Short mmCIF file of C-alpha atoms and ligand atoms in Angstrom, two decimals:
data_model
loop_
_atom_site.label_atom_id
_atom_site.label_comp_id
_atom_site.label_asym_id
_atom_site.label_seq_id
_atom_site.Cartn_x
_atom_site.Cartn_y
_atom_site.Cartn_z
CA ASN A 1 23.48 -4.94 10.23
CA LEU A 2 21.43 -2.22 8.54
CA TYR A 3 24.36 -0.21 7.23
CA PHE A 4 23.63 1.48 3.95
CA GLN A 5 24.76 -0.52 0.92
CA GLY A 6 23.33 1.55 -1.94
CA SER A 7 21.64 0.11 -4.98
CA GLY A 8 22.71 -3.33 -6.07
CA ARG A 9 23.54 -4.71 -9.46
CA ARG A 10 19.80 -5.24 -9.90
CA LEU A 11 18.54 -3.85 -13.20
CA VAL A 12 15.23 -3.83 -15.04
CA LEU A 13 15.38 -4.90 -18.69
CA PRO A 14 12.51 -3.52 -20.83
CA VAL A 15 11.15 -5.27 -23.92
CA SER A 16 8.45 -3.90 -26.22
CA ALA A 17 7.01 -5.24 -29.48
CA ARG A 18 4.04 -4.31 -31.67
CA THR A 19 2.25 -7.65 -31.13
CA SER A 20 1.70 -9.75 -28.05
CA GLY A 21 3.28 -12.47 -30.22
CA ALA A 22 6.38 -10.51 -31.19
CA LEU A 23 6.91 -9.81 -27.46
CA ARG A 24 7.41 -13.49 -26.60
CA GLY A 25 9.83 -13.95 -29.48
CA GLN A 26 11.81 -10.77 -28.94
CA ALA A 27 12.28 -11.72 -25.29
CA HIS A 28 13.60 -15.10 -26.41
CA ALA A 29 15.83 -13.47 -29.04
CA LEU A 30 17.37 -11.24 -26.38
CA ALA A 31 17.98 -14.34 -24.27
CA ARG A 32 19.79 -16.17 -27.08
CA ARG A 33 21.87 -13.04 -27.80
CA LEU A 34 23.04 -12.74 -24.19
CA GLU A 35 24.04 -16.41 -24.12
CA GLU A 36 25.97 -16.20 -27.41
CA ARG A 37 27.80 -12.93 -26.65
CA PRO A 38 30.00 -13.03 -23.51
CA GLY A 39 31.18 -9.51 -24.24
CA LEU A 40 27.69 -8.05 -23.66
CA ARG A 41 27.66 -6.63 -20.14
CA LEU A 42 24.31 -6.50 -18.39
CA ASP A 43 24.43 -2.74 -17.78
CA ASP A 44 25.07 -2.06 -21.48
CA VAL A 45 22.11 -4.19 -22.54
CA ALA A 46 19.89 -2.35 -20.04
CA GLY A 47 20.96 1.10 -21.27
CA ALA A 48 20.67 -0.07 -24.87
CA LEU A 49 17.17 -1.43 -24.31
CA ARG A 50 16.16 2.11 -23.28
CA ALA A 51 18.06 4.36 -25.71
CA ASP A 52 18.06 2.20 -28.86
CA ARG A 53 14.52 0.90 -29.05
CA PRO A 54 11.12 2.61 -29.29
CA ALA A 55 8.84 2.03 -26.31
CA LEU A 56 6.12 0.11 -28.18
CA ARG A 57 2.59 -0.94 -27.12
CA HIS A 58 3.15 -4.53 -25.90
CA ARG A 59 5.61 -4.57 -23.01
CA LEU A 60 7.22 -6.80 -20.42
CA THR A 61 10.28 -6.63 -18.18
CA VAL A 62 12.68 -8.82 -16.28
CA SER A 63 14.77 -7.91 -13.23
CA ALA A 64 18.27 -9.31 -13.01
CA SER A 65 21.45 -8.86 -11.02
CA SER A 66 23.48 -10.91 -13.52
CA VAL A 67 23.43 -12.33 -17.04
CA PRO A 68 22.37 -15.95 -16.33
CA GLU A 69 19.52 -14.60 -14.19
CA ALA A 70 18.37 -12.29 -17.01
CA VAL A 71 18.57 -15.12 -19.55
CA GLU A 72 16.57 -17.48 -17.34
CA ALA A 73 13.87 -14.86 -16.70
CA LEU A 74 13.63 -13.89 -20.37
CA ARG A 75 12.90 -17.50 -21.39
CA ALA A 76 10.13 -17.76 -18.80
CA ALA A 77 8.87 -14.30 -19.73
CA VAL A 78 5.12 -14.09 -20.37
CA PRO A 79 3.36 -10.78 -21.12
CA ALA A 80 1.43 -9.92 -17.96
CA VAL A 81 -0.39 -6.60 -18.53
CA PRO A 82 -2.53 -5.43 -21.46
CA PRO A 83 -0.92 -3.32 -24.21
CA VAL A 84 -0.41 0.26 -23.08
CA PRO A 85 -3.40 2.56 -23.67
CA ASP A 86 -3.27 5.42 -26.12
CA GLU A 87 -3.45 7.95 -23.40
CA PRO A 88 -1.02 7.37 -20.49
CA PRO A 89 -2.77 5.54 -17.65
CA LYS A 90 -3.65 7.14 -14.36
CA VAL A 91 -1.94 5.89 -11.19
CA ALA A 92 -3.53 5.39 -7.76
CA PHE A 93 -1.81 4.50 -4.47
CA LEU A 94 -3.65 2.09 -2.17
CA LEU A 95 -2.52 2.42 1.44
CA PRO A 96 -3.32 -0.54 3.74
CA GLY A 97 -4.58 -0.49 7.30
CA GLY A 98 -3.50 -2.46 10.32
CA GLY A 99 -2.96 -6.17 9.96
CA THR A 100 0.00 -6.55 7.59
CA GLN A 101 2.86 -5.02 9.59
CA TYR A 102 5.83 -7.16 10.63
CA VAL A 103 9.32 -6.81 12.06
CA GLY A 104 11.86 -6.43 9.27
CA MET A 105 9.54 -4.90 6.65
CA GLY A 106 11.39 -2.64 4.23
CA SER A 107 14.78 -3.48 5.78
CA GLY A 108 16.04 -4.18 2.27
CA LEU A 109 14.87 -0.77 1.05
CA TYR A 110 16.34 0.84 4.13
CA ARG A 111 19.77 -0.32 3.04
CA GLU A 112 19.54 0.18 -0.70
CA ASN A 113 17.46 3.29 -1.25
CA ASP A 114 18.56 6.61 0.19
CA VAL A 115 15.11 8.23 -0.09
CA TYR A 116 13.64 5.31 1.88
CA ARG A 117 16.48 5.48 4.42
CA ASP A 118 16.15 9.27 4.84
CA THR A 119 12.37 9.22 5.16
CA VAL A 120 12.54 6.51 7.84
CA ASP A 121 15.34 8.35 9.68
CA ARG A 122 13.39 11.63 9.68
CA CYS A 123 10.14 10.05 10.87
CA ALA A 124 11.98 8.17 13.62
CA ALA A 125 13.47 11.42 14.95
CA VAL A 126 10.18 13.35 14.85
CA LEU A 127 8.42 10.49 16.70
CA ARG A 128 10.86 9.99 19.61
CA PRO A 129 8.96 12.42 21.93
CA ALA A 130 5.51 10.91 21.39
CA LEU A 131 6.63 7.29 21.04
CA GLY A 132 9.25 7.04 23.78
CA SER A 133 11.63 4.98 21.64
CA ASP A 134 13.47 4.90 18.33
CA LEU A 135 10.99 3.62 15.73
CA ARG A 136 13.79 1.84 13.87
CA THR A 137 14.06 -0.71 16.68
CA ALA A 138 10.41 -1.62 16.09
CA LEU A 139 10.85 -1.54 12.30
CA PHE A 140 13.93 -3.71 12.01
CA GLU A 141 14.79 -5.58 15.24
CA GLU A 142 11.85 -6.39 17.55
CA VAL A 143 8.44 -5.05 18.56
CA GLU A 144 5.55 -5.91 20.83
CA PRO A 145 2.66 -6.98 18.53
CA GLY A 146 -0.17 -4.48 18.43
CA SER A 147 1.83 -1.84 20.31
CA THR A 148 1.85 1.85 19.41
CA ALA A 149 5.28 1.34 17.85
CA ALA A 150 4.07 -1.62 15.77
CA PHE A 151 1.40 0.49 14.08
CA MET A 152 3.67 3.53 13.71
CA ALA A 153 6.13 1.21 11.98
CA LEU A 154 3.44 0.50 9.39
CA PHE A 155 2.51 4.17 8.96
CA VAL A 156 6.13 5.19 8.37
CA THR A 157 6.73 2.22 6.07
CA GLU A 158 3.80 3.25 3.86
CA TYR A 159 4.98 6.85 3.87
CA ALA A 160 8.62 6.02 3.10
CA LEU A 161 7.63 3.59 0.34
CA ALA A 162 5.35 6.16 -1.32
CA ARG A 163 8.09 8.83 -1.23
CA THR A 164 10.47 6.28 -2.74
CA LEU A 165 8.09 5.60 -5.64
CA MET A 166 7.50 9.33 -6.15
CA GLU A 167 11.24 9.99 -6.33
CA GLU A 168 11.39 7.46 -9.17
CA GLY A 169 8.82 9.62 -10.94
CA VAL A 170 5.76 7.50 -10.12
CA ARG A 171 3.52 10.13 -8.75
CA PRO A 172 -0.07 9.23 -7.93
CA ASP A 173 -3.05 10.86 -9.58
CA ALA A 174 -5.29 9.61 -6.76
CA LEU A 175 -5.00 8.05 -3.32
CA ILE A 176 -7.08 5.80 -1.13
CA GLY A 177 -6.18 4.50 2.32
CA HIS A 178 -7.85 1.82 4.42
CA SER A 179 -8.36 2.86 8.03
CA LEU A 180 -4.89 3.92 9.21
CA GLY A 181 -3.79 4.20 5.56
CA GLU A 182 -6.06 7.21 5.19
CA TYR A 183 -3.59 9.18 7.34
CA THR A 184 -0.77 8.24 4.98
CA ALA A 185 -2.94 9.33 2.07
CA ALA A 186 -3.64 12.67 3.79
CA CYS A 187 0.10 13.25 4.31
CA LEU A 188 0.87 12.32 0.70
CA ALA A 189 -2.01 14.53 -0.58
CA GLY A 190 -0.87 17.60 1.37
CA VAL A 191 -3.87 17.58 3.73
CA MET A 192 -1.51 17.02 6.68
CA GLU A 193 2.19 17.57 7.24
CA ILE A 194 4.00 14.35 8.08
CA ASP A 195 5.92 15.92 10.98
CA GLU A 196 2.71 17.07 12.68
CA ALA A 197 0.79 13.89 11.82
CA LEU A 198 3.37 11.48 13.32
CA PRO A 199 2.80 12.29 17.05
CA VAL A 200 -0.96 12.69 16.57
CA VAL A 201 -1.32 9.29 14.89
CA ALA A 202 0.70 7.79 17.74
CA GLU A 203 -1.55 9.22 20.46
CA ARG A 204 -4.55 8.18 18.39
CA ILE A 205 -3.32 4.56 18.37
CA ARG A 206 -2.90 4.65 22.16
CA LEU A 207 -6.41 5.99 22.67
CA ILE A 208 -7.88 3.33 20.38
CA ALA A 209 -5.89 0.50 21.99
CA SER A 210 -6.85 1.55 25.51
CA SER A 211 -10.56 1.49 24.64
CA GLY A 212 -10.56 -2.37 24.58
CA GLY A 213 -13.09 -4.47 22.69
CA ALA A 214 -12.60 -6.86 19.81
CA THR A 215 -12.77 -7.07 16.03
CA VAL A 216 -13.76 -10.01 13.82
CA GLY A 217 -13.13 -10.23 10.07
CA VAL A 218 -16.00 -11.97 8.27
CA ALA A 219 -15.69 -13.49 4.78
CA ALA A 220 -19.10 -12.36 3.58
CA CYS A 221 -20.70 -9.24 2.21
CA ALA A 222 -22.09 -6.71 4.68
CA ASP A 223 -25.71 -7.33 3.61
CA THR A 224 -25.45 -10.91 4.86
CA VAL A 225 -23.75 -9.82 8.10
CA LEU A 226 -25.85 -6.75 9.01
CA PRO A 227 -29.01 -8.61 10.27
CA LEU A 228 -26.85 -10.47 12.84
CA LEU A 229 -25.73 -7.27 14.69
CA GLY A 230 -26.20 -6.83 17.60
CA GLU A 231 -26.42 -4.50 20.54
CA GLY A 232 -22.77 -3.90 21.29
CA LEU A 233 -21.61 -4.33 17.67
CA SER A 234 -20.77 -1.99 14.80
CA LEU A 235 -19.95 -2.63 11.19
CA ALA A 236 -16.29 -1.65 11.29
CA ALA A 237 -15.41 -2.04 7.59
CA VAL A 238 -17.21 -2.94 4.37
CA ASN A 239 -14.34 -4.19 2.28
CA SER A 240 -15.55 -6.21 -0.76
CA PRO A 241 -18.41 -8.54 -1.81
CA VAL A 242 -16.84 -11.26 0.40
CA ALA A 243 -15.22 -9.24 3.21
CA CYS A 244 -16.32 -7.04 6.07
CA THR A 245 -15.33 -6.61 9.71
CA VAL A 246 -17.33 -6.22 12.91
CA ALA A 247 -16.17 -4.57 16.12
CA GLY A 248 -17.62 -4.09 19.61
CA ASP A 249 -17.24 -5.31 23.14
CA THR A 250 -15.78 -8.73 23.54
CA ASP A 251 -18.87 -10.52 24.79
CA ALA A 252 -21.00 -9.29 21.88
CA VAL A 253 -18.30 -10.38 19.42
CA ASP A 254 -18.19 -13.82 21.09
CA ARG A 255 -21.92 -14.15 20.54
CA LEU A 256 -21.71 -13.03 16.91
CA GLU A 257 -19.01 -15.63 16.18
CA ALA A 258 -21.23 -18.36 17.60
CA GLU A 259 -24.07 -17.33 15.30
CA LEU A 260 -21.72 -17.04 12.33
CA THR A 261 -20.46 -20.47 13.09
CA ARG A 262 -24.06 -21.78 13.21
CA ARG A 263 -24.69 -20.40 9.70
CA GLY A 264 -21.43 -21.58 8.10
CA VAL A 265 -20.13 -18.02 7.69
CA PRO A 266 -16.31 -18.07 7.75
CA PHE A 267 -14.66 -15.54 10.05
CA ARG A 268 -11.51 -14.93 12.00
CA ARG A 269 -10.92 -12.90 15.15
CA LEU A 270 -8.41 -10.17 14.43
CA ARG A 271 -5.35 -10.35 16.67
CA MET A 272 -5.45 -6.71 17.85
CA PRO A 273 -7.89 -6.58 20.93
CA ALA A 274 -9.34 -3.26 19.84
CA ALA A 275 -12.60 -2.07 18.33
CA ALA A 276 -11.69 0.75 15.98
CA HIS A 277 -14.64 2.10 13.98
CA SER A 278 -17.26 1.27 16.59
CA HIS A 279 -19.18 2.76 19.51
CA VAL A 280 -16.44 1.46 21.84
CA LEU A 281 -14.40 4.54 20.86
CA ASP A 282 -17.04 7.11 21.97
CA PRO A 283 -15.38 7.86 25.37
CA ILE A 284 -12.17 9.06 23.65
CA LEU A 285 -13.49 10.99 20.63
CA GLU A 286 -13.30 14.48 22.20
CA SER A 287 -9.83 13.89 23.57
CA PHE A 288 -8.84 12.67 20.13
CA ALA A 289 -10.25 15.84 18.55
CA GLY A 290 -7.97 17.86 20.83
CA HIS A 291 -5.00 16.16 19.20
CA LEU A 292 -6.55 16.68 15.77
CA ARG A 293 -6.73 20.41 16.54
CA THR A 294 -2.92 20.54 16.61
CA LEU A 295 -2.81 19.75 12.88
CA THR A 296 -2.62 22.35 10.13
CA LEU A 297 -5.17 20.89 7.67
CA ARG A 298 -5.03 22.00 4.02
CA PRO A 299 -7.13 21.06 0.99
CA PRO A 300 -5.79 18.05 -0.92
CA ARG A 301 -3.37 18.67 -3.76
CA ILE A 302 -3.71 15.05 -4.85
CA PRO A 303 -7.34 13.85 -4.82
CA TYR A 304 -8.23 11.02 -2.46
CA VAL A 305 -11.36 9.11 -1.49
CA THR A 306 -12.09 8.90 2.24
CA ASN A 307 -13.47 5.83 3.95
CA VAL A 308 -16.09 7.98 5.71
CA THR A 309 -18.26 8.28 2.58
CA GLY A 310 -16.54 5.90 0.20
CA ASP A 311 -16.26 8.87 -2.16
CA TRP A 312 -13.85 11.66 -3.12
CA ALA A 313 -13.01 13.86 -0.14
CA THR A 314 -14.16 17.48 -0.36
CA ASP A 315 -11.91 20.34 0.66
CA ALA A 316 -14.39 21.02 3.49
CA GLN A 317 -14.12 17.43 4.76
CA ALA A 318 -10.33 17.23 4.43
CA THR A 319 -9.93 20.36 6.56
CA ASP A 320 -12.59 19.54 9.19
CA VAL A 321 -11.66 18.08 12.59
CA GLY A 322 -15.09 16.46 13.00
CA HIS A 323 -14.75 14.64 9.69
CA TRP A 324 -11.44 13.21 10.88
CA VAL A 325 -13.25 12.23 14.08
CA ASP A 326 -15.86 10.51 11.89
CA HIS A 327 -13.06 8.71 10.08
CA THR A 328 -12.01 7.11 13.38
CA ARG A 329 -15.55 6.32 14.63
CA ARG A 330 -17.44 5.28 11.47
CA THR A 331 -17.42 2.30 9.13
CA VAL A 332 -14.51 2.15 6.71
CA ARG A 333 -16.40 2.20 3.37
CA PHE A 334 -13.52 0.83 1.37
CA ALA A 335 -15.54 -1.21 -1.18
CA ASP A 336 -17.52 1.90 -2.15
CA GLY A 337 -14.36 4.01 -2.20
CA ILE A 338 -12.39 1.70 -4.49
CA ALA A 339 -15.38 1.74 -6.89
CA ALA A 340 -15.55 5.54 -6.76
CA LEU A 341 -11.81 5.70 -7.45
CA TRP A 342 -12.06 3.25 -10.35
CA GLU A 343 -15.09 4.76 -12.10
CA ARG A 344 -13.43 8.17 -12.40
CA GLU A 345 -9.86 7.33 -13.43
CA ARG A 346 -9.72 3.57 -14.28
CA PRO A 347 -6.18 3.87 -12.89
CA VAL A 348 -3.39 1.41 -12.34
CA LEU A 349 -3.83 0.35 -8.71
CA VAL A 350 -0.55 0.36 -6.78
CA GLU A 351 -0.56 -1.07 -3.27
CA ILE A 352 1.87 0.93 -1.12
CA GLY A 353 2.76 -1.15 1.92
CA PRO A 354 3.38 -4.78 2.86
CA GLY A 355 1.32 -7.48 1.22
CA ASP A 356 -1.68 -7.53 -1.08
CA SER A 357 -4.72 -7.07 1.16
CA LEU A 358 -6.17 -4.06 -0.68
CA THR A 359 -5.28 -5.58 -4.06
CA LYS A 360 -7.47 -8.62 -3.33
CA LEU A 361 -10.35 -6.44 -2.17
CA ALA A 362 -10.02 -4.26 -5.29
CA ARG A 363 -10.06 -7.34 -7.55
CA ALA A 364 -13.16 -8.71 -5.79
CA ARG A 365 -14.96 -5.36 -5.96
CA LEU A 366 -13.92 -4.38 -9.49
CA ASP A 367 -14.59 -7.79 -11.04
CA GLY A 368 -14.68 -7.92 -14.00
CA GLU A 369 -13.52 -4.47 -15.09
CA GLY A 370 -10.02 -5.94 -15.41
CA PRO A 371 -8.06 -3.56 -13.17
CA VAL A 372 -4.29 -3.63 -13.45
CA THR A 373 -2.79 -4.06 -9.99
CA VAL A 374 0.76 -3.66 -8.77
CA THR A 375 2.19 -4.86 -5.50
CA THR A 376 5.12 -3.16 -3.93
CA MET A 377 6.31 -4.92 -0.76
CA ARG A 378 6.35 -8.58 0.26
CA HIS A 379 4.30 -10.41 2.91
CA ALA A 380 6.02 -11.34 6.17
CA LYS A 381 6.86 -14.89 5.11
CA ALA A 382 8.07 -14.21 1.57
CA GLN A 383 11.63 -15.03 0.65
CA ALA A 384 12.09 -12.38 -2.03
CA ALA A 385 14.42 -9.45 -1.50
CA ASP A 386 12.74 -6.07 -0.98
CA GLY A 387 14.70 -4.55 -3.85
CA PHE A 388 13.70 -7.34 -6.19
CA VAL A 389 10.05 -6.82 -5.25
CA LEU A 390 10.43 -3.08 -5.91
CA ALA A 391 12.24 -3.57 -9.22
CA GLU A 392 9.44 -5.90 -10.39
CA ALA A 393 6.83 -3.31 -9.39
CA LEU A 394 8.62 -0.58 -11.37
CA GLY A 395 9.08 -2.80 -14.43
CA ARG A 396 5.42 -3.80 -14.35
CA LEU A 397 4.39 -0.16 -13.99
CA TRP A 398 6.46 0.62 -17.08
CA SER A 399 4.84 -2.32 -18.90
CA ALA A 400 1.40 -0.90 -18.10
CA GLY A 401 2.39 2.44 -19.65
CA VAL A 402 3.84 4.46 -16.75
CA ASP A 403 7.06 5.32 -18.55
CA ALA A 404 8.66 7.32 -15.74
CA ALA A 405 8.63 4.10 -13.67
CA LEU A 406 11.56 2.56 -15.59
CA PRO A 407 14.76 3.28 -13.65
CA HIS A 408 18.11 4.72 -14.85
C1 DUV B 501 -7.36 0.78 10.93
O1 DUV B 501 -6.37 0.66 10.30
C2 DUV B 501 -7.31 1.17 12.41
C3 DUV B 501 -6.12 0.55 13.14
C4 DUV B 501 -6.23 0.70 14.67
C5 DUV B 501 -5.09 0.00 15.42
C6 DUV B 501 -5.03 0.43 16.88
C7 DUV B 501 -4.98 0.78 18.01
C8 DUV B 501 -7.29 2.68 12.49
O2 DUV B 501 -8.38 3.29 12.61
O3 DUV B 501 -6.18 3.28 12.45
#
């Protein structure tokens, strides 16, 4: 059952000291105090940790739904982020592309968080005409892998999760999306309106899927891979010094994999039999533009880097149908874009969506600038509750210096 339950007992307990060393001890002191004081309710400690202490430079948090849990976590507590900077840090949202979606994602947030519930409900209703079904079936019960609904489930999950973070007062200073995630970024930035984007993204997915072809993810930098392509092959994504993807017709991809295998290059065929970001899409570009022409495009009110150039999007690009056509046809320059995003703001990098695929690419590309990264929703196999994962994210954001992230 996905009946609304509201927020749990789950609370975030903040701790801040003036030394990394006083942090460890003060977290252990608080643990002893909770043991030796059965009067102390958990909600009073939480409120008191906010109102009665100054938010100092060295921070950590625990999440807990009860007192023994909080005590256990406070003993194991290790500072995890650097001391907060003197100016408040910038925040960036990283919005993943296809590949991480799964049935059941965000079902915990759907039942605890009314912004997440309402955003999902609204998107599901807008999408019924283009999709032919209720998206919430695909989100929470069952879905055909790689279907239109499966990818729309990811788009709406990213969008709902970002709205949920923004309602907590975590608003991004910059955005970057990977592939499909660039549409979520555009909706969040004000370039597109979510209600107009939803059916257009859906028809876009259908046109890409019906174009056939194949995509292979290669664990190597693009400079190593480029000489091996390939009539019938395009560089589909340049993701990090050890990650790129190649797309084209199936026979050409087969041949590339044989050559990669002869050179010891690790690779894996992506499950979706499509070839987004390659010449295979040429026959549907004009028809896709016709759908793009239904959108009211506006200049971004939150800055974002586009995968077309791997750089900040201009107002002229954001509002241009042919640029959005380029976004679908051309290499996703994510490695360049994450470096452009980092050089300007040095922001906290917050992955908005299931898993940690963009976080790993950011860490590989930004080595060793020491980026602070925050993950926001679990992988398909993880046993953690969605609301626990979210509470941890918000605590960690507060520990990095994003004060509005602490709930209550
Ligand atoms: C990247 O995320 C691509 C996903 C295509 C899936 C289909 C069909 C994209 O360009 O959206």
